[PDB]
Amino acid sequence: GADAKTVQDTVTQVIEQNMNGIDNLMYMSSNSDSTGTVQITLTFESGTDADIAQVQVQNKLQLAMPLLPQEVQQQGVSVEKSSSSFLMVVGVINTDGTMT
Amino acid sequence: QLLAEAAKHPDMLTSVRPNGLEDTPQFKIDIDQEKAQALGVSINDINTTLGAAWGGSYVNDFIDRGRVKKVYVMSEAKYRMLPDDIGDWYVRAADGQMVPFSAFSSSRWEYGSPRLERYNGLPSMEILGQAAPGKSTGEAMELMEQLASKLPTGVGYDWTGMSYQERLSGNQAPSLYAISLIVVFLCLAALYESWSIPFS
Amino acid sequence: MPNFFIDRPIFAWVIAIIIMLAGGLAILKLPVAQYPTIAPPAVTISASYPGADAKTVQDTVTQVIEQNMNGIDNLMYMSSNSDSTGTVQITLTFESGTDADIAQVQVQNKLQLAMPLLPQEVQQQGVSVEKSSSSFLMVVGVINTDGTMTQEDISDYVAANMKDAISRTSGVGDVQLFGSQYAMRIWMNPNELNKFQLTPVDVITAIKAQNAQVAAGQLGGTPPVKGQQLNASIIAQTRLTSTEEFGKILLKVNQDGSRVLLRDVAKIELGGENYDIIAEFNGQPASGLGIKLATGANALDTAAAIRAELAKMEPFFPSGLKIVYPYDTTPFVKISIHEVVKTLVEAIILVFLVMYLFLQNFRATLIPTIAVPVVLLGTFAVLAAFGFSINTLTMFGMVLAIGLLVDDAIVVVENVERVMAEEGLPPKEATRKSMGQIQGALVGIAMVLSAVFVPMAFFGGSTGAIYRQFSITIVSAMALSVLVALILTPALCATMLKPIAKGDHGEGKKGFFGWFNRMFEKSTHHYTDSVGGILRSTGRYLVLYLIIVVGMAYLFVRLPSSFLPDEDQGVFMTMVQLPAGATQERTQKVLNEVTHYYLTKEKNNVESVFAVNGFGFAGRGQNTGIAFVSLKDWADRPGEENKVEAITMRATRAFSQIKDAMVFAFNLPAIVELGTATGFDFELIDQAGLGHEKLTQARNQLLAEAAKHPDMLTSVRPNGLEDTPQFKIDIDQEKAQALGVSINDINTTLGAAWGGSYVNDFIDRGRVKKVYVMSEAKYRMLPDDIGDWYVRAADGQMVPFSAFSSSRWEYGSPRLERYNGLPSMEILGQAAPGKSTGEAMELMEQLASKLPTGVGYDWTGMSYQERLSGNQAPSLYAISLIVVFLCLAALYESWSIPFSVMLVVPLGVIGALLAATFRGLTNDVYFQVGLLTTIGLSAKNAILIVEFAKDLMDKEGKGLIEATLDAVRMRLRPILMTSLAFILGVMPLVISTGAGSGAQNAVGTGVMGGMVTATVLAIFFVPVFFVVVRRRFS
Amino acid sequence: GMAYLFVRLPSSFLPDEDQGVFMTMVQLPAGATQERTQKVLNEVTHYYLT
Amino acid sequence: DIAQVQVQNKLQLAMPLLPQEVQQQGVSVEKSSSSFLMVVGVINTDGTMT
Amino acid sequence: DTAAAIRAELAKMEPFFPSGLKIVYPYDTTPFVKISIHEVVKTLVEAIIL
Amino acid sequence: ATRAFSQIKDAMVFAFNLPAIVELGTATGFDFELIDQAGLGHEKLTQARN
Ligand SMILES: N[C@@H]1CCN(C[C@H](O)COc2ccc(Cl)c(Cl)c2)C1
């Protein structure tokens, strides 16, 4: 329930302020949505240990966690290895038409 | 301006589009707190009413067929669509009187970005496009950066994702060729014990 | 193998080219830092609970966090401090080699699960887990020369405009703001609050209600009606933005209709989140950014990038804003690296000069000039491969290994030239014969030097980390030198050297060179005659060798020990400690006096003073302060009296006359990450819940007992604060209930007024900033001001604090310490002069054994490492001796001949000690590694002599005495010329007196003395050992 | 001639393949509702299936 | 180590949703064997402690 | 190694125990491991002798 | 011990030795899981297990 500008000021900038100084970080791209979502991707160099990169990103994020609004902590800020492409889509239909 | 310039080159660039959303209108609600206190309606009650009715409020969990699921309270659609539906929602006062939102609230229209993007910590916008049939992606990137060089001051560019890898490969190709040639030359000199055969 | 490359010079050239390319790539890619990771990994948990004393923080925060630090791997120990400023710091120290990231994430995760157990205020302020095992690469301060900006303004500007871009700079690992952003400060007036029957609770509630973000919803949101066309997001109450908006917050409306706003009962401004620390640069308000170097980064490049970025920022600064560098050790690092590189280059040039002086051949002099740089580049490549960086330890290790490198090159080239000038063979066959003579000896020397230097890498702890740099560097350089001596150098000798006649020893030359040749020939004849005379009476010289060994033991025992020399790094520190209960103003006056002294009485030596009033060492309060004094360039400070040593002692002597303040000026440690080399660190543990008072009594008893042993223990002092007066408020709860006053309101009013309360955030210029409500300073200074504060009752009447509470003065700890989860007190000391640290620790343990029941002890810091690595050296060096003996037996095919080599070890060592004894140096790391290199060179010379003698005895019918004489004759020249080259190369280090002169002198003095005595003694002691051994076992 | 050919040869990264699947992105103007997007999506589905 | 890190990174998302009483007791994430390495008991020979 | 560290910690604690308190090891499999490995070493030595 | 404790009518009492490796268990044993995978409930799962 927050504007993109407000969530960017309260969440995105605060988080990405401390995302510098991480090993083998090629670049970073973030976006802030009108629904209050903040999505920050840190792309590292090829051959980097993704587990170590995730641990370092967690270590850098925990410095900013107290500076985020209480509702953000309540919703939970997740740090995890990510991919940008779907391996597959598994759809489910109803051949009888009885299910909406 | 960059997109307009890119549209002028249909023979090289195709389907050049921005990977983002245009600025959307937003409905600003101004809740006057002193009027609410004068009418005897708590500000927390007003906030809860507005958020729950229009935005939906997650209350707590229940059990559906043995699975924990969420319970949501939200306004029915017909009372939630248009800006003039705000008047149908009332809030009880300390004395039990039901006060309308119009009695203590006003509204207006503004504009704002629904999705703000940043690259390397600076505001940015992502653009997507293809190379026209018969053209390569390298030529497309060359034309794109040529067009971007003619933008106002303080507006730079960069390549990301696939284009970043393509740029890196192109940049490091000549050094790869030189190093491989030197390695083969040294290997030949070592094996055949001569500087003549390596050069020949 | 040498024969393979003599016939294939181009293949050897290809190998050399590959080594050179690898070394160049490493040099372009190696990281550069002053020192490597020496301290054990350490993780600090910092939390703040504003307005609380040490005991409140300890009971509500420190103990709760400590009780949940379980299941974390490789933890050596844990310590914690809880200060009267409301701050708790918990340092967890892990075993060396522990992954810092894994330890940090484990600590943070165990703290995540303990977060719900902490007070809501601690959770709101946030608990930060950081890696404290590193130090600042640089400090960039920002001042205003116009006086238009306060400290808070400069800090806010730095946070908003400078910090982000500096953080984005390449090679920057962490940026810490020396200040804080703006905060919405609400300074409440108790009189005005009582006028309108308001309390701080009302202000907090109003701020929370009227400064918030409310989720509103969405127009046409899903699920929509069947004909919806418009979808828009609804915006509602948002955070306030300016002081005007906060001042307009409405607290109440009176019956007459007059409105009470926040501006009426409080002053609204943009201040700082905290006011404990006041930073000044030469008396002007200042902020700053501390910049830490990233892992694997180049310090010089990072500093250059930071300075370039600051220059880019400069044109956009407000009028009067200026950038300064209060603490910058990067110039010291640059000058040190330059000095080491220059030392290497001049060593190569001096080797060239000695080659030309002795051989009188130009193409002979080129061969070492090609070999040595190749070995150095290969060493750089090897260091890059093993994940090492270019630091002081590795660079000085390379400097030390120059001796062995030049020795190998000189041995090969000189032996080839000698064969050419004796047998008259052309270069190729002479090179073949020389390599056939020396190849096995070179391989054995490689094995022996590996045995000598590898055991250094297996020491434990921080000292082990320091000796592993030297071990790896010197071992890699030695291995590459030996490989080059078998691959490239023989090929160069075969391809480049011109033929020499069968009997040309240079006497036919004219000028200086002919005279030099004749002089050296007659000197060699005299030396051989004297050696024969010695071998006729070996017993007297065996007695002399026993005397030498006894003197070596004498000097080794009486040589003081140390870790690293102190350096004049262009900066030092001055700590001021005022009496308990002193305020910020008094500490500021003391700091201003210190700054005036430094900028007037030392204006030719001091560039700036960075006075930080608010925290010092082992404490943080209004009665402590620290000043960071930066010195001018070493070029501008010529002479002994203008260095950090003399300047600091003069400053301390001048400050000794300051009253009501203990002020001490001192130099930085060699490695700031560890304040080691200050004796022993001791922990006195409350093991039975005795309490703070009984622990204080036990500590006092221990200190009194320690004072009774001045001959063993010196300056045994507590590393903490004594109990200070505290103002106790006893709230009578029955009275509070009787008058209708809730205890929650009473406590909230008291804490918010006198301690300050963080309420919520607000958006200033697109940044979140905290909102604080505190009493205006006028009304929270003295006990009487307690009577100015009222609390509203349920009946609506404002009751004063005097109606339901009494007050008194008690004593309490302003700083509570814990070690390994138990209450503790830290005691620092050092052994008396002439006493070792181990025996001082033993006496401390004996004294502690007689302390009251329930009081234990532990050793932390450097004492813990000393107990870990105390007995390692003798065992590893016994293994080294055994391996060296086995390698020598393999080389010589004899069980006894090895001894004739192994006896050379004292001959060099004694000299080093003498050089260390006369110059006043100590047994530090540099001295020990230089001693090892001298031992290696002496062993190399003895090995070559014994190899030549035994080859003469075996492959020819020459006798023991005749073979020994001919061997010493053949080996005299290379020994002398190598010793001359190395001594001349290390002369600058001995004579150095500028920047980095401490380490340079430590490295050079021992090397000089050991080389001189080894060259003088071995040349007629090794033949004695060989002859005696061959006579006994035959 | 080799240098001339090298300089004029266009560059890319990897050839595009026919993987049996592709995507179609649809973006309506700002403020458009789910029903209009569904209408546009129904058109795209019709195109591919007719 | 990494398994525990990932498990706790997923658990801190659920932690806010757990009952406050559960949080006050302390949720623990551990990586240990299912069997006791040892049992260290404590008695009072004097019999003066319960 | 963990058992040895635990024993060292208990040895550190023991001097400060209240009078009568005493530690026991009702369940420790370490002695079995020690004796088994020692027995295998003894069999190796005896095999060399034989 | 098991034969003697079989006479205890108040409880199921079994004495047992641990295996060489605790986790491996018995070489002829199997561990089986019956899953309620249609939202049947606890009672229907109990009936299926019976
Ligand atoms: N955050 C507070 C506020 C102000 N800030 C001052 C810093 O203490 C700067 O003082 C120095 C200067 C040099 C070094 Cl090397 C170090 Cl460690 C500290 C502290």
> For position C533, which CATH number holds?
1.20.1640.10
**By the 8 A CB rule, do C926 and C968 touch?**
no
Residues on chain E touching G22 (C-beta within 8 angstroms)? 33-35
Question: DSSP class of residue B132?
Answer: P
Residues 65-94 of chain C with CB under 8 A from chain F are none
Report the alpha-carbon distance of residue G11 to residue C1006 in Å, rounded.
81
Helix (H, G, I), strand (E, B) or coil at C731: strand
In a shared domain, residues B38 and B104:
yes
- Which of C154, C177, C178 to probe ligand 1 with, by most ligand atoms within 8 A of CB? C178
In a shared domain, residues C256 and C218:
yes
Question: Do the chains contact at E27 and C113, CB–CB below 8 Å?
Answer: yes
Question: DSSP class of residue D28?
Answer: P
**Residue C979 has which token pair?**
């010793």
In a shared domain, residues B19 and B63:
no
The residue among C67, C72, C109 with the most chain E CBs within 10 A of its CB, best to mutate, is: C109
The count of residues in chain E is: 50
**By the 8 A CB rule, do A69 and C761 touch?**
yes
> For position B156, which CATH number holds?
3.30.70.1440
Question: Cα torsion at A51, A57, A58, A61 (round to 10°)?
Answer: -170
| Residue A95 Cα, gap to closest chain B Cα (Å) | 24
**By the 8 A CB rule, do E14 and F3 touch?**
no
Q: Which of C297, C328, C359 is the last residue of a domain?
A: C328
Q: Which domain holds residue C602?
A: 569-676
Report the alpha-carbon distance of residue C625 to residue C111 in Å, rounded.
31
**Residue C520 has which token pair?**
């050296």
Report the alpha-carbon distance of residue C13 to residue C491 in Å, rounded.
8
| Residue G9 Cα, gap to closest chain E Cα (Å) | 29
Candidates C844, C888, C816; CA nearest to C713 is: C844
- Which of C291, C325, C327, C673 to probe ligand 1 with, by most ligand atoms within 8 A of CB? C327
Query: Between the CA of residue C668 and those of C134, C569, F29, what are the distances in Å?
Result: 15, 8, 52
Report the alpha-carbon distance of residue C474 to residue C401 in Å, rounded.
6
Task: Kindly report the protein residue whose alpha carbon is nearest to atom 6 of ligand 1.
Answer: C178
Question: DSSP class of residue C457?
Answer: G
In a shared domain, residues B99 and B154:
no
| C-to-N gaps above 2.5 Å in chain C, after residues | none
Report the alpha-carbon distance of residue C680 to residue C842 in Å, rounded.
11
**Torsion angles phi and psi, residue C92, rounded to 5:** -105, 120
Burial of E5 by CB count in 10 Å (0-12 exposed, 13-18 middle, 19+ buried)?
buried
Report the alpha-carbon distance of residue C915 to residue C866 in Å, rounded.
27
The count of residues in chain D is: 50
Candidates C622, C788, C769, C754; CA nearest to C269 is: C769
HSE (CB half, 13 Å, CA atoms) of C417? 26
**Residue C585 has which token pair?**
């103003």
Residues on chain C touching D35 (C-beta within 8 angstroms)? 224, 226-229
**By the 8 A CB rule, do C670 and C564 touch?**
yes
- Which of C46, C135, C139 to probe ligand 1 with, by most ligand atoms within 8 A of CB? C139
Q: Does C856 touch chain F (CB under 8 A)?
A: yes
User: Chains touching chain E at 3 or more Cβ pairs under 8 angstroms?
Assistant: A, C, F, G
Task: Kindly report the protein residue whose alpha carbon is nearest to atom 17 of ligand 1.
Answer: C136
User: Chains touching chain A at 3 or more Cβ pairs under 8 angstroms?
Assistant: B, C, E
Question: DSSP class of residue F18?
Answer: P
DSSP-assigned states of every residue in C211-260: S-----EEETPSS--TT----EEEE------SHHHHHT-EEEE-TT-PEE
- The two beta strands, C798-800 and C620-631, are unpaired
Q: How many domains does chain C have?
A: 8
- Nearest by CB: A58 against E9, E14, E15: E9
Amino acid (1-letter code) at residue C671:
I
CA of C612 to the centre of ligand 1 (A): 7
In a shared domain, residues B71 and B100:
yes
Resolution in units of Å: 2.6
**By the 8 A CB rule, do B106 and B30 touch?**
yes
Amino acid (1-letter code) at residue C1024:
V
In a shared domain, residues C187 and C249:
yes
Report the alpha-carbon distance of residue C956 to residue C943 in Å, rounded.
19
Chain A, nearest residue to E18 by Cα? A74
The alpha carbon of residue B16 and the mean position of all alpha carbons in its chain are separated, in whole angstroms, by: 17
In a shared domain, residues C561 and C657:
no
**Residue C455 has which token pair?**
């055991």
CA of C328 to the centre of ligand 1 (A): 13
In a shared domain, residues B130 and B155:
yes
Whether there are 3 or more C-beta pairs closer than 8 Å between C and B is yes
Residues on chain C touching E5 (C-beta within 8 angstroms)? 105-106, 109
Residues on chain C touching B37 (C-beta within 8 angstroms)? 250, 253
Find tokens 């910058």 and name the residue: C328
- Which of C276, C612, C613, C671 to probe ligand 1 with, by most ligand atoms within 8 A of CB? C612
Residues on chain B touching D31 (C-beta within 8 angstroms)? 24-25
Report the alpha-carbon distance of residue C458 to residue C932 in Å, rounded.
15
Amino acid (1-letter code) at residue C305:
A
The count of residues in chain A is: 100
Residues on chain B touching C250 (C-beta within 8 angstroms)? 33-34, 37
Report the alpha-carbon distance of residue C786 to residue C74 in Å, rounded.
50
In a shared domain, residues B92 and B72:
yes
- Nearest by CB: B54 against C217, C224, C225: C217
Helix (H, G, I), strand (E, B) or coil at C315: helix
- The two beta strands, C284-293 and C321-328, are unpaired
Residues on chain B touching C218 (C-beta within 8 angstroms)? 54-55
Q: Which ranges constitute the DSSP H helices of C326-361?
A: 330-359
Report the alpha-carbon distance of residue C335 to residue C316 in Å, rounded.
32
Cα–Cα–Cα angle for C637, C638, C642, nearest 5°? 60
Amino acid (1-letter code) at residue G48:
A
The count of residues in chain G is: 50
CA of C715 to the centre of ligand 1 (A): 28
Q: How far separated are the first and last CA of chain A, in Å rounded?
A: 29
C-beta atoms surrounding C847 within 10 Å: 21
Question: Do the chains contact at D31 and C222, CB–CB below 8 Å?
Answer: no
**By the 8 A CB rule, do C142 and C134 touch?**
no
Query: Between the CA of residue D3 and those of A72, B179, C79, D6, D8, what are the distances in Å?
Result: 59, 18, 68, 5, 9
The count of residues in chain C is: 1034
In a shared domain, residues B69 and B133:
no
- The two beta strands, B24-31 and C232-235, are parallel
Q: b/e per residue, D14-40, with b = 16+ CB within 10 A?
A: eeeeeeeeeeeeeeeeebbbebeeeee
Q: Which of C676, C710, C732 is the last residue of a domain?
A: C676
Q: Which residues pair with C683 in a beta bridge?
A: C826, C858
CA of C627 to the centre of ligand 1 (A): 9
Residues 4-33 of chain E with CB under 8 A from chain A are 5-6, 9, 12-16
Q: Which ranges constitute the DSSP H helices of chain A?
A: 4-7, 13-17, 50-64, 70-75
**Residue C40 has which token pair?**
């054990």
CA of C596 to the centre of ligand 1 (A): 20
In a shared domain, residues C598 and C622:
yes
The ligand 1 atom nearest the CA atom of C279:
4
Report the alpha-carbon distance of residue B148 to residue B6 in Å, rounded.
10
> For position C627, which CATH number holds?
3.30.70.1430
Residues with CB under 6 A from ligand 1: C 136, 139, 178-179, 277, 279, 288, 326-327, 610, 612, 628
Candidates C270, C275, C267; CA nearest to C779 is: C267
In a shared domain, residues C475 and C336:
yes
Query: Between the CA of residue E23 and those of B159, C124, C753, what are the distances in Å?
Result: 46, 17, 32
Report the alpha-carbon distance of residue B62 to residue C123 in Å, rounded.
30
Q: b/e per residue, C639-675, with b = 16+ CB within 10 A?
A: eeebbbeebbebbeebbeeeeebebebebbbbbebbe
Chain B, nearest residue to G39 by Cα? B65
C-beta atoms surrounding C167 within 10 Å: 20
C-beta atoms surrounding C315 within 10 Å: 6
Question: Do the chains contact at F25 and E40, CB–CB below 8 Å?
Answer: yes
Question: Do the chains contact at A5 and B116, CB–CB below 8 Å?
Answer: yes
CA of C151 to the centre of ligand 1 (A): 13
Cα–Cα–Cα angle for C603, C609, C615, nearest 5°? 150
The ligand 1 atom nearest the CA atom of C274:
3
Chain B, nearest residue to G40 by Cα? B65
Report the alpha-carbon distance of residue A76 to residue G12 in Å, rounded.
47
